[PDB]
Amino acid sequence: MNLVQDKVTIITGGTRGIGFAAAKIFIDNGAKVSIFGETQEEVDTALAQLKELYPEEEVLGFAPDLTSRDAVMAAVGQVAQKYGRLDVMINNAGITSNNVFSRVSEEEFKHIMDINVTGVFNGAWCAYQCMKDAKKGVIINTASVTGIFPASKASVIGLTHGLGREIIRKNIRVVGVAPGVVNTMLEPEEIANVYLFLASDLASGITATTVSVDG
Amino acid sequence: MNLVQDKVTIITGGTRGIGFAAAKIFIDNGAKVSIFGETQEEVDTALAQLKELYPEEEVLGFAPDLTSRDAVMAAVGQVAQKYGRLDVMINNAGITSNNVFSRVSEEEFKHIMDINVTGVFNGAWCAYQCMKDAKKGVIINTASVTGIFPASKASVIGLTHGLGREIIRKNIRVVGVAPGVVNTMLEPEEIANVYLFLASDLASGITATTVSVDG
Amino acid sequence: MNLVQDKVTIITGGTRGIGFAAAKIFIDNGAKVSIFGETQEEVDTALAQLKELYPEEEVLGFAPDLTSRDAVMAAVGQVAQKYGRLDVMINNAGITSNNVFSRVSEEEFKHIMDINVTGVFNGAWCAYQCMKDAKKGVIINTASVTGIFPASKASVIGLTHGLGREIIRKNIRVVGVAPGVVNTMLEPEEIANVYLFLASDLASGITATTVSVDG
Amino acid sequence: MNLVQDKVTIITGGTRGIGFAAAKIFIDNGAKVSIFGETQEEVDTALAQLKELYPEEEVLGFAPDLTSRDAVMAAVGQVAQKYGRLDVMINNAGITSNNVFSRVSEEEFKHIMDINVTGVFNGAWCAYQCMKDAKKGVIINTASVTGIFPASKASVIGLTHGLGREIIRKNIRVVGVAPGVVNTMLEPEEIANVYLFLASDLASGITATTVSVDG
Ligand SMILES: [Cl-]
Ligand SMILES: [Cl-]
Ligand SMILES: [Cl-]
Ligand SMILES: [Cl-]
Q: Record-annotated residues binding NAD(+) (chains A, B, C, D)?
């Protein structure tokens, strides 16, 4: 089965955990996958591991600062330059707090918001600019548990519902995934399998909503 | 692809619309499908149409009164008798009101509750009795738009969340589907494709929640 | 303070618990209160207790079968006959299951649905017929925890949202209350205080939604 | 009636709209009110207008940068210094986007997040440090419509639910308000009346949830 056959796909946070599991599952299902990661070194490690699994598959990797819309746009532009289009944007990157509320620093809080909310907005915005005249595309936003208490989780859910209803006219689907607690309990593959379904044409009826995955 | 290969499946309201579309899609994906319908004549018409499409496929059909837990249990028992087990219960049957609130009769309202809430509870309860010692199973509850204003929709959603968390221990998944407006606009296949994903092992991480399908 | 001064109010399930606490609080706040209860004997006991607290207050009591829309309409008609109008309908009556899901009888389940969903619909429908030409009124629906696991809770929430948006044009507010676990932990007064606020003109901006009171 | 008698209250964004309406209503109901605003000049204008209405009432005003947790903490510290305590924190300040999604600038988006999410977190965190040993307090978070499409709205809702459940042990209530479209349609007083109820002891049963005020 090849549920995402020939779908040009970007996976943010694609060097570890759910993201990396999604990269494998998407390659298995016929996608043309590119990963974004935190640093180019982490990206290159993940690309080497993917090459161990899929020696014949081309996989691009980039490390834009997700908090910079310009950097995200440049990296999206390179993917579109290679393949001519972007079919699926998976805003999967997210972080968790070290601390509970009473002890979280202003700097940690803003950093969580920066990755979990601004990063997802940036990925969605950039993917939209790329897909808006194609009358086809899927943007999947991951609403990860904040660690603090969630706040960032609910923001991505709101982002997903609002954006989905606003651009429904353009035939771009926008869908969320709210995972529970994952193993480095859900396995990462169990979340990635949901990405897979949502990216596929089997989910053509699903937009402007978020799927809870708990299990 | 055979996302529900060898899954013994019952689809309520399986003679028309979403239900019938699900019957076809499930047969295509390797399931052993049985349909329940409103009357045995409607069931036999649907079975004849399925035989036109799949001349070699065995498909059982029954017409238990969904408001009678005993009748539902008997029909579930016949399926388990044929196949030795029940893997997937799809409580898809639902009805819509003729009238808006101010004009709906007490009799129409109770009838909607009877099919849309009691019928789904009966199907879920009966499927649970059948699956409870198997440590495997999926119950999918459809929360259809009431027509009145939903009420029945939200009841099935609550039923799905409560039941799912209660029997999570038994490794039975319980999931809901809340479809939007369907064409006799979403096509029925677009809803049935969600049933398919949720019945499959790709949805192993999904339980005690409802997926909105609007689109 | 007299937050519901001269508001003609009906409280279903008004002989015990939250309902009875609401009767007292509403009388204290200047309402003209009538209670509905399960039987006329229970009603008369509650009326005697209210007279102990408020010797000068008139309080009517009725015991319509909440599952019979005709009986509810007759009892609403008597209140409107006494006072000329109905300002506030509080569909507070609800029951809980003895049993968990696997052991609940078909008869217990239908009885819970009958009181918790049909009864609330009947109260809302009857109050609407009474209030629809007044361009003023509040219907408060209580969505109580099913006891089973939810189902009835979510149905009343859906009922409240749908009905509220449908009759917003008529300047009738429809609002829900979803209480947590109450003491015969929340005290009953803590729920009744929310009824009070929602019935008052301070809640004029609140309709087609449900307030959770947990905690 | 004096629903918040002697409650030391801070209202962010208290110089206009809902905030200013809340200042008046809270003063009327016996609170000791302090307002935070965008600039000290806007604050002084609002204080002059409040003095026109309440010549004998003391009202403090501050203009901390809500995006700076240190500045918010200093201003909360001045209020606690004047009155010895903080009873009610109302994180009411919020902004709306000029632009829809496709045209919103990275700078506008971050600014909205900064006020609508970081500002509310800062206010809540600072109020918590102040109230945590008092075993009494209310934090009200306003989840305002983003303007963009939601995102900030859902983040405050998540913040409110998570924080409320985390500090329920401390007898500090945390509650949200999600207003609809307001007149400079709901009037600002209709939202402020909800703040009033939620700050009062009538809402003692309400925490870790958000009230929608639409309507
Ligand atoms: Cl390969
Ligand atoms: Cl065949
Ligand atoms: Cl008296
Ligand atoms: Cl004064």
A: 15-18, 38, 42, 92, 153, 182-184
Q: Please name each of the domains of chain D with its CATH number.
A: 2-215 (3.40.50.720)
Query: Which residue type does D188 have?
Result: P
Q: Give resolution in angstroms.
A: 1.9
Cα(C87)–Cα(C7) distance, rounded to whole angstroms?
5
Q: How far apart are CA B171 and CA B204, in angstroms?
A: 10
Give the sign of the dihedral formed by CA A29, CA A31, CA A34, CA A38: negative
- For ion ligand 1, residues whose CB falls within 5 Å: A 54, 56-57
> Terminus-to-terminus CA distance in chain D, angstroms?
24
Q: What residue of C is the nearest CA neighbor of B150?
A: C158
Give how far D109 is from chain A: nearest CA, Å: 8
The residue among B2, B201, B186 whose CA lies nearest residue B88 is: B201
Name residue D5's amino acid. Q
- What does the DSSP 8-state code read for residue B117? I
Active site residue A7: no
- Assess whether chains A and C touch, using the rule of 3 or more C-beta pairs within 8 angstroms: no
| DSSP conformational letter for D24 | H
Termini Cα distance of chain C:
24
Residue with tokens 């926008």: A174
Integer CA distances (angstroms), C173 to A66, B133, C56, C124, in order: 45, 48, 31, 11
Ligand 4 ion: Cβ-proximal residues, 5 Å cutoff: D 54, 56-57
DSSP per-residue codes, D92-122: ------SS-GGG--HHHHHHHHIIIIIHHHH
